[PDB]
Structure 1
């Protein structure tokens, strides 16, 4: 599913991401924009053989099982395919664990490089929330 901007902001708020670990909703929307362009079916293969999945491009090295990332973990206890669902529950729940890991949203390199320190509120501007 490709979400609209405000549609995703609302879904993320529904699932409790607004101000989760102190990160305002705009941060989460901005991260999703640049990770996946709001596409739940987004995948990207990494140089190390791990794969990133879903709207927030969550990596199989640590967070999900895809059966093809040697030596990896599955800390969110889910198949990586769950991260591709039209239902964002699994992505959100796993993102909560990731952002609690110690480095906050810096875990998402695209957030650090493209969202961090910008006017992220613009991402939810105009949305009915």
Structure 2
């Protein structure tokens, strides 16, 4: 599924991300934009052989099982395919674990480089939330 910006903002809010670990909703929407262009089915293979999955490009090295990332963990206890669903539940629940992990949203390189410190509220401007 490719979400609209306000559509995704509303779904993320409904799934409990607004101010989760202190990150306002616009941080999550910005991160999704630059990670996946709001496409739940986004995947990207990394040089280490791990793969990033879904709207927040969650990586198989640590967070999900794809059966093809040797030595990796599955800390969210899910198949990576779960992160590609039109229903964002799996992605959201896994992201909550990731963002609680110590480095906050810096875990998402695209967030650090393209959202952190910017007017992220603009990503939810005009949305009914």
TM-score normalized by the length of structure 1 = 1.00
Kindly state the Cα deviation for residue 36 of structure 1 after the two structures are TM-superposed.
0.1
Kindly state the Cα deviation for residue 28 of structure 1 after the two structures are TM-superposed.
0.1
**Structure 1: 4+ residue segments shifted above 4 A:** none
Runs of 5+ in structure 2 lacking a partner?
none
1:20-75 deviation digits (Å, cap 9, x = unpaired): 00000000000000000000000000000000000000000000000000000000
Kindly state the Cα deviation for residue 104 of structure 1 after the two structures are TM-superposed.
0.1
Aligned length: 129
Instruction: Tell me the distance in 2 between the aligned counterparts of 1:67 and 1:96.
Output: 23
Instruction: Tell me the distance in 1 between the aligned counterparts of 2:30 and 2:2.
Output: 15
SS in 1 for 2:7: helix
Kindly state the Cα deviation for residue 89 of structure 1 after the two structures are TM-superposed.
0.0
1:60-98 deviation digits (Å, cap 9, x = unpaired): 000000000000000000000000000000000000000
Kindly state the Cα deviation for residue 99 of structure 1 after the two structures are TM-superposed.
0.1
